């Protein structure tokens, strides 16, 4: 139960569907499955062909250049889980160069544990934007999809209605489906670990993705970790053993597995049937247990291995001694560094040389954890034990606090390393102790670390003068030991509301230093009031072919601006909702020019117009229109409105409104905005 | 007459005006004159001090850090000509770091034949824009003027009226003078070579600059070429011999000159008293004649010489054999190449290596005329007989039609040569015969020749469609041996009123070549009618570390619209 079929370890199928019937009954394939290179197949060769029995694949799965096939909903309706122990350039699902493959129907796929998915050169495939990979994968940014039918936008990959979840991702709701029929199932935000059932209840704590009954280890569909006899289990109870991270086997099983290479003979450690023991361990004639002892040499093929992915990496997983040379070349675009670290150099020695060529995203080398010694018994051509070229993101090699390095023979080869400055280079020379080896042009002294000023020399500001429209800085004028080499001063400035982070200045006359009255400076005019700015300065000096005087840069500093008379208080609306109440409302001004303290409010009693007092309204023409000195005032604080009381019925009022960004000394305030209003008659 | 004083050859004066009275009477100083490093001088130390006796200096003249002096019209009112045989970084007049020096008054200076003038760090000097150098010099674009009182625009350097010629040069009439009194004299457009007299009449065909009477070899002021006894002469009549390009001397004079190094012992050849003979020649015990014979090793100091100017060059003038190594380093800014050719390697051999470092304006090496062999017996470190770095204008080395090259040992070193494409580099490897020596990265395969598409491959347009609003070009689709490497098509377009000489296109599908219907095109909309356009295409491909497939460029074509 939970798995009615068998194991049937992975065999890959070619050229016709004849050997496909060898892999019918089995429920979970150990290893991987590849289906490839069937040019003489037909669409009718798949309609009489289905395998619902497969549920989980351990390692990976591949589809490559088979004609006549258009879907996968029939061949594998019920594949659900990919564990991904053995990966494939950090992928586990290969959909590639498949002519006529237009859809998947892979709705039952729920979680892919480790790896990613690459889809390429499949000019019929659609229904792809309807696939939320985050429900199935963790690192969705490692999924390359290109050269497909969706890339020429034609497919209406729709479903009739509600069912399929239309979830917002980037711009709007994305309807999630697999076919026009099959929606993409979404478990709720609490059943995410072990999957959910049909109504959405959480499964048992050892289920995964699907369960036949909610909260039942005996009625799951897929185990999260381990399987044992109708129960998904958290661990192997004694005397059982974890085999390939998915099940518990007895002693006799992994015992008799050893007896068949007479190829991967097996041993036991940590209640686990494993291939081999690491260093300091020994087999056992009784039970094949990795016993500790006194004193693991992974001798390469031809002493050499190009290393480019996890597929390369797991071949040297757990090794301690490398009897060969290593080549690091990853044309990448994605940091694999943690997974790179996870199966790498728990070693000290490399018998031959080390090569690092044209890798892109490798920012560091700290994943070499215990790496100490370079023997270099076989050197790189040009007499090198070390190589380095074309590493666009490499900045740090190691912290030389506790990391060490011993290099027996060979030399260093540093070229085209635009984020690798010479400081840690010479530190590596020092800690290597091999400084008396390197000739000229063993280090490219024009390309290595030429994107940021690095090394040592720091500028220090002597004086700061600020204004609302002026900036002056004063700092110590540094001079290199040849004072003629100073060409000028590179200055970078910008504004910065955060703190999470261009002009040039001629050098002055040096001419002495009892009183070198040459403290250099620059005036900025382009200032905004009350505004935070971020400024730093670099020294422009002449390059020399020798050990050049490294030149200085300044600290990034933050200086905020001041303030000034705020702008016009926008839209004064003066409504009189009562006979003595006038609401005046307004918008903030366009330029507050500082933190606004208050709003200066003036209301002025405008008398009636004086020409009306000497007119004869008893004559026809009686058309009446239904309409320093201290004025009454208000400092409206933290409000964009003000109702005014104690007002006359039938009296027009002038209103002068200003804002004020300064209140306590000598009020800096806005310019006058005007309106006029009239109270209601009683 | 014409020169009543004497020669008094060049000695340079330091630390006080005491030794200056050694050089009083003399008419034309052979060699050079430098006056330097006098801090404790006063302006009163010059009003009782004048030398009108000097008219011409042969080689050069230098003024360096002497205080209290403000002018020069008193010390040398009548210096007139600088010939300029021995130069000083292609200058013959050095005015440098002179505190209080505010004007010149050097009105009698008329022609400077060879060399230039450099002015620097003289924060008192003015009257500078009033000096037409074209009247006095030829290559006026080799004159360096900076760090002066003129550089902070204050001096009104005017004259009271007419006198001084106000000549349009660049923007308007430029008044030409030396002081507020001394105008700059301009001879007419017919008396230009030999100079003019006061009223403007032409001087004699052997005069130069000034003449006491117009058209009189016996009443010149300065000779054009040669002097003999009150007459400026075109050459030496017998039995006389040319000495230092300015006079005629007898056999007795240059004879007795030889008898004094017992340092420049002299011989005679080609009716000339000269220092030495070139290769294949022999002296004479009777008359010191460069007689031809069968079979000039300019053995250097420590086998090494940095070469930077003509002053470095004339030390190796006319050499044939170099027992040493040469360093070519000219942070220049001006092409010296003709005069560089004028006194250089009529040679075939170099015993040591050759170095070329950071030279800027050297577009070619054709001034190397006869060079064939490098022995390389002392190498550049790193086992090189040859060196090349940082040459921002170097494109051609030589024409390998007739130029040859023989290399014994050593290697090649090519870096940062941004207009030096690899084709002629491999041709140099071939004609050298030392192709089986160069390792990896002896040639910078990224920086050498990366400013213009060079190598081989030419695009050819199959079809042309024009309009007044549409342009379509179709060409033969080139495909490299890895068709994946083609990433796009770089196109450069612009209009062209003369013929004296930007968009991208994606690559189409290769997929076959019985019928590769992939003749690629671009439609242009931005057309003006009746307008001539200049269009050409480059192929954008993938770099590889190996011998990369060089990529194609098209021809600059001209298309006139409707």
């Amino acid at each position: 139960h939970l798995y009615p079929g068998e194991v049937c370890p992975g065999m890959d199928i070619r050229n016709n569907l004849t050997r496909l019937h060898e892999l019918e009954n089995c429920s979970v394939i150990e290893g991987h499955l590849q289906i490839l290179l069937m040019f003489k197949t037909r669409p009718e060769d798949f309609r009489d062909l289905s395998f619902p029995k497969l549920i989980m694949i351990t390692d990976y799965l591949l589809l490559f250049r088979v004609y006549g096939l258009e879907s996968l909903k029939d061949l594998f309706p019920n594949l659900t889980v990919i564990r991904g122990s053995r990966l494939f350039f950090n992928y586990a699902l290969v959909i590639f160069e498949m002519v006529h493959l237009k859809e998947l129907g892979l709705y039952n796929l729920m979680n892919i544990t480790r790896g990613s998915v690459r889809i390429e050169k499949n000019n019929e495939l659609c229904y792809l934007a309807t696939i939320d990979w985050s429900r199935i994968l963790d690192s969705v940014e490692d999924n390359h999809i290109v050269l497909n039918k969706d890339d020429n936008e034609e497919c209406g990959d729709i479903c009739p209605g509600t069912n399929c979840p239309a979830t917002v991702i980037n711009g709007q709701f994305v309807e999630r489906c697999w076919t026009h029929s099959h929606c993409q199932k979404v478990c709720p935000t609490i059943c995410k670990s072990h999957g959910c059932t049909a109504e959405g209840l959480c499964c048992h704590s050892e289920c995964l993705g699907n369960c036949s009954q909610p909260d039942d280890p005996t009625k799951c569909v897929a185990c999260r970790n381990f399987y044992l006899d109708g129960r998904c289990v958290e661990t192997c109870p004694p005397p059982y053993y974890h085999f390939q991270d998915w099940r518990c086997v007895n002693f006799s099983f992994c015992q008799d597995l050893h007896h068949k290479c007479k190829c991967h003979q097996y041993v036991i450690h940590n209640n686990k049937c494993i291939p081999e023991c690491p260093s300091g361990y020994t087999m056992n004639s009784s039970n094949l247990l990795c016993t500790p002892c006194l004193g693991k040499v992974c001798h390469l093929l031809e002493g050499e291995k190009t290393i480019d992915s996890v597929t390369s990496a797991q071949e040297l997983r757990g090794c301690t001694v490398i009897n060969g040379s290593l080549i690091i070349n990853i044309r990448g675009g994605n940091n694999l560094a943690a997974e790179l670290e996870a199966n790498l150099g728990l070693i000290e020695e490399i018998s031959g040389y080390l090569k690092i060529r044209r890798s892109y995203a490798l920012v560091s080398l700290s994943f070499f954890r215990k790496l100490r010694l370079i023997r270099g018994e076989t050197l790189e051509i040009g007499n090198y034990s070390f190589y380095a070229l074309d590493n666009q993101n490499l900045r740090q090699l190691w912290d030389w606090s506790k990391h060490n390095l011993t290099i027996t023979q060979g030399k260093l080869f540093f070229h085209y390393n635009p984020k690798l400055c010479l400081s840690e280079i010479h530190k590596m020379e020092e800690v290597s102790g091999t400084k008396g080896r390197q000739e000229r042009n063993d280090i490219a002294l024009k390309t290595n670390g030429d994107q940021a000023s690095c090394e040592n020399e720091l500028l220090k500001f002597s004086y700061i003068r600020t204004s609302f429209d002026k900036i002056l800085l004063r700092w110590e004028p540094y001079w290199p030991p040849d004072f003629r080499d100073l060409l000028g001063f590179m200055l970078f400035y910008k504004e910065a509301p955060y703190q999470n982070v261009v002009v040039d200045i001629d050098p002055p006359l040096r001419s002495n230093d009892p009183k070198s009255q040459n403290h250099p400076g620059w005036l900025m005019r382009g200032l905004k009031p009350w505004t935070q700015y971020a400024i730093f300065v670099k020294t422009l000096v002449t390059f020399s072919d020798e050990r050049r005087t490294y030149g200085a840069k300044s600290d990034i500093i933050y200086v905020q601006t001041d303030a000034t008379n705020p702008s016009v208080p926008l839209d004064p609306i003066s409504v009189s909702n009562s006979s003595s109440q006038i609401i005046l409302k307004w918008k903030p001004p366009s330029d507050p020019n500082g933190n606004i303290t208050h709003y200066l409010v003036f209301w002025e009693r405008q008398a009636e117009d004086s020409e009306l007092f000497e007119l004869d309204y008893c004559l026809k023409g009686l058309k009446l229109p239904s309409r320093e000195e201290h004025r009454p005032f208000e400092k409206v604080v933290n409000k964009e409105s003000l109702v005014i009381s104690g007002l006359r019925h039938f009296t027009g009022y002038r209103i002068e409104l200003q804002a004020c960004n300064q209140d306590t000394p000598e009020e800096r305030c806005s310019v006058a905005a005007y309106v006029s209003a009239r109270t209601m008659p009683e | 007459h014409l020169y009543p004083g004497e020669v008094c050859p060049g000695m340079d004066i330091r630390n006080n005006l005491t030794r200056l009275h050694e050089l009083e009477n003399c008419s034309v100083i052979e060699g050079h004159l430098q006056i330097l490093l006098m801090f404790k001088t006063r302006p009163e130390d010059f009003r009782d001090l004048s030398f009108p006796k000097l008219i011409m200096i042969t080689d050069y003249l230098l003024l360096f850090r002497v205080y209290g002096l403000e002018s020069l019209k008193d010390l040398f009112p009548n210096l007139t000509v600088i010939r300029g045989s021995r130069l000083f970084f292609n200058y013959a007049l050095v005015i440098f770091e002179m505190v209080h020096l505010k004007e010149l008054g050097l009105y009698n200076l008329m022609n400077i034949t060879r060399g230039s003038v450099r002015i620097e760090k003289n924060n008192e000097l003015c009257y500078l824009a009033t000096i037409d150098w074209s009247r006095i010099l030829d290559s006026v674009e080799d004159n360096h003027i900076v760090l002066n009182k003129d550089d902070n625009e204050e001096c009104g350097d005017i004259c009271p009226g007419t006198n001084c010629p106000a000549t349009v040069i660049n923007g308007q009439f430029v008044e030409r003078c030396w002081t507020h009194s001394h105008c700059q004299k301009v001879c007419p457009t017919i008396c230009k070579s030999h100079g003019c007299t006061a009223e403007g009449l032409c001087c004699h065909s052997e005069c130069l600059g000034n003449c006491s009477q117009p058209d009189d070899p016996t009443k010149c002021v300065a000779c054009r070429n040669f002097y003999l006894d009150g007459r400026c002469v075109e050459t030496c009549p017998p039995p006389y011999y040319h000495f230092q390009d300015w006079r005629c001397v007898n056999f007795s004079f240059c004879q007795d000159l030889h008898h004094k190094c017992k340092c420049h012992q002299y011989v005679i050849h080609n009716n000339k008293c000269i220092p030495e003979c070139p290769s294949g020649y022999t002296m004479n015990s009777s008359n010191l004649l460069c007689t031809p014979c069968l079979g000039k090793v300019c053995h250097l100091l420590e086998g090494e010489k940095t070469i930077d100017s003509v002053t470095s060059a004339q030390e190796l003038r006319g050499c044939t054999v170099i027992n040493g190594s040469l360093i070519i380093n000219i942070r220049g800014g001006n092409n010296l190449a003709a005069e560089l050719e004028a006194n250089l390697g009529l040679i075939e051999e170099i015993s040591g290596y050759l170095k070329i470092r950071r030279s800027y304006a050297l577009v070619s090496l054709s001034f190397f005329r006869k060079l064939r062999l490098i022995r390389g017996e002392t190498l550049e470190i790193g086992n090189y007989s040859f060196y090349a770095l940082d040459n921002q204008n170097l494109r051609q080395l030589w024409d390998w039609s007739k130029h040859n090259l023989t290399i014994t040992q050593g290697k090649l070193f090519f870096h940062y040569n941004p207009k030096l494409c690899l084709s002629e580099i491999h041709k140099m490897e071939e004609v050298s015969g030392t192709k089986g020596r160069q390792e990896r990265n002896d040639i910078a395969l990224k920086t050498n020749g990366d400013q213009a598409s060079c190598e081989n491959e030419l695009l050819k347009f199959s079809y042309i469609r024009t309009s007044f609003d549409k342009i379509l070009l179709r060409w033969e689709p080139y495909w490299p041996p890895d068709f994946r490497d083609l990433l796009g098509f770089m196109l450069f377009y612009k209009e062209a009123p003369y013929q004296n000489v930007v968009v991208d296109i994606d690559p189409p599908l290769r997929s076959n070549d019985p019928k590769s219907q992939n003749h690629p095109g671009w439609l242009m909309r931005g057309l003006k009618p009746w307008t001539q356009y200049a269009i050409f295409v480059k192929t954008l491909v993938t770099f590889s570390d190996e011998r990369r497939t060089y990529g194609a460029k098209s021809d600059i074509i001209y298309v006139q619209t409707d």
Partner: peptide
């Protein structure tokens, strides 16, 4: 027979033209 450096689908179709029938098995060990 082309005399040219080959990659991609060009090389794929070339290999299929060479093979025709079976051409390639997949038994490294079994």
């Amino acid at each position: 027979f082309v005399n040219q450096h080959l990659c991609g689908s060009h090389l794929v179709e070339a290999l299929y033209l060479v093979c025709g029938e079976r051409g390639f098995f997949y038994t490294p060990k079994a």
